[PDB]
Design a protein around this ligand. Sequence first.
Ligand SMILES: Cc1ncsc1-c1ccc(CNC(=O)[C@@H]2C[C@@H](O)CN2C(=O)[C@@H](NC(=O)CCCCCCCCCC(=O)NCCN2CCN(Cc3cccc(-c4ccc(N5CCN(C)CC5)c(NC(=O)C5=C(C(F)(F)F)CC(=O)N=C5)c4)c3)CC2)C(C)(C)C)cc1
Ligand code: NA
Lengths: 148, 303, 87, 103
Amino acid sequence: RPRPVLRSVNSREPSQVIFCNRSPRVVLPVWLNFDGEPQPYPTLPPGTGRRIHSYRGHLWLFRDAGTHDGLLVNQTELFVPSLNVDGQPIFANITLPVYTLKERCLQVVRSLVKPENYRRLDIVRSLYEDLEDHPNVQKDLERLTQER
Amino acid sequence: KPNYALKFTLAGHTKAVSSVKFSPNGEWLASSSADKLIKIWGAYDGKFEKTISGHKLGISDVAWSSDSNLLVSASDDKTLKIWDVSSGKCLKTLKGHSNYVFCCNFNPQSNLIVSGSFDESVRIWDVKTGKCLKTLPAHSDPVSAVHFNRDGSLIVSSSYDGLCRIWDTASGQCLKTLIDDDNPPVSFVKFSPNGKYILAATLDNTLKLWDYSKGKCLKTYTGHKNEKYCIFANFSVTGGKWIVSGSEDNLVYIWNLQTKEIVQKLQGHTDVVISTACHPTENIIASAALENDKTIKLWKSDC
Amino acid sequence: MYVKLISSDGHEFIVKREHALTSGTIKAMLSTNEVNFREIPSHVLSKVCMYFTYKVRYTNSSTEIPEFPIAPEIALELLMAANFLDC
Amino acid sequence: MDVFLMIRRHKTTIFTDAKESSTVFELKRIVEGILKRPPDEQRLYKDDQLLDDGKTLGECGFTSQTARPQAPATVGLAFRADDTFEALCIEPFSSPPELPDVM
Ligand SMILES: Cc1ncsc1-c1ccc(CNC(=O)[C@@H]2C[C@@H](O)CN2C(=O)[C@@H](NC(=O)CCCCCCCCCC(=O)NCCN2CCN(Cc3cccc(-c4ccc(N5CCN(C)CC5)c(NC(=O)C5=C(C(F)(F)F)CC(=O)N=C5)c4)c3)CC2)C(C)(C)C)cc1
Ligand code: NA
């Protein structure tokens, strides 16, 4: 069975959005083009927000810009602008997920250890593999596809 | 049906070739390229004549004055340049656009230049002084093509906003817009030689021939591939009456204007054929291709 | 209701049952309301309990969520514990 | 304004939450539910300072900013039976090993 390509619908209907970075990370906005390919956009420092122009039915994801850890937007993975009403921008509130303790530990250990050095750590092999399985937008694309 | 065959390949440029234009006197072919250069070639034998340099970034388009003495170039460096072809001198640098200049054309009198830019404006320039006379910003996305009509009283522009706009040259006011049921980006537009129609390309693999007096689409040409690049199309009227266009499958497509049937596909280029030109008096087509190719080809036909 | 989680060095950590059941391992070990860990030491288990509180407080809360801080000196053992506890 | 706490005595640590407006006495009632000693047999401390039963947690220094779910503030606990008062005594946690070379 053909699996749906998560992609922006090319509606050519403008939508103004506030990208609100309510996280402590440097945020990389990621726009899925009409072919479903991720495109990185300019980054947002923690504690900042920007008014930006997008379009109805376009698809956005948000990651840590340095580590590509996945982030949430309006409490979910994907942000899709709709039509503005009454001249009001659409807020895209970008926040930290509540990571599992294990994933948060992996994040910190990865931030401390060069990948080449992971297997010097005195831990079991499955934790090596966990450390080596870096965050990846494509993982979320695959999961959100298998959910639809 | 015509029988265009390859005669010459001109391999002078070191990057994508953006535009080829025959001089109105039929003697020369001008080519512009992402390598920041204009080159002049013999129209009939493809013999290199000269290199014209001055732009600081790649060149998107060139156009000849009616007397074949002047060229105008449109550049990524946000300027146009007016050149004396015999000397290779930059006569004027037209400044005013605030982003890449993609397209340019003289009017038939050749006292005006029209330009179109990523900055979403169409500009009208005085050839004598180089001053910008009017800025027309109604388009809401990059302008892909600009062309004057037979007496210079109209300008037609095409834009990624999906519109063709017909402008009154004297006042600057937009006299008409042209659009079908859908709004794909319009990648190319030009008035027919005869003046009655407008040929417009859209990034849905489609060329359309419009009666712009009646706002009616008369013909539609497909079979080629055109979804990404702004490909220049042409009327061929020296023999039979054909529509000519490049294609993203590296071919030159030739259609019968009335039947809309593909009558030829010219193979040889190894990248997107972004530009085609038709010789003013003889059955000669020039074509030019992007970065994997970098060459110009000249093709000739008995009809 | 509360449960008592006992570290390898004998520290007792009394936490709400709902917080402890964040870990399917702890749930399996509860099946007394006390769990004795044979290897996880107190400095790690106290951090795990703080994670439980943070997780329950901020999960599906629609608010700005702060980072869960982990010092480098504790990170590797905390990783080992989080893996074992599956939390 | 919520505050998140560790109430600590000997080798026992209770994780609980309260409010800046909660009184020390309320905290003792929470403790009583768990350890089964009444508030009049409890003394609560912030560092070496005995806390007055009627002061609110905010008046003692426990704010939402310094008493977070992920970094709770510590309240010390000591018991009392009639005329015998147990001194405040909190056993420290273990210590992490030397940070590995690759970190
Ligand atoms: C703050 C900030 N902080 C955190 S984040 C954030 C933020 C910042 C900014 C924004 C802006 N907002 C968005 O970006 C939104 C966000 C999201 O919602 C999507 N989106 C959009 O705006 C999108 N737009 C829309 O959704 C509605 C309108 C989009 C139009 C539909 C496009 C149809 C698909 C076609 C396609 O796939 N194209 C891809 C490849 N092209 C290649 C050319 N690119 C550049 C370009 C764009 C436009 C025109 C021309 C053009 C046109 C004509 C010519 N020439 C004409 C004359 N010929 C003779 C020659 C060619 C040339 N020129 C050339 O091509 C050229 C050369 C050559 F010809 F050789 F190639 C050589 C050379 O030296 N120089 C130039 C160029 C060229 C564009 C992409 C999009 C713009 C990202 C697409 C948002 C946030
Ligand atoms: Na990280």
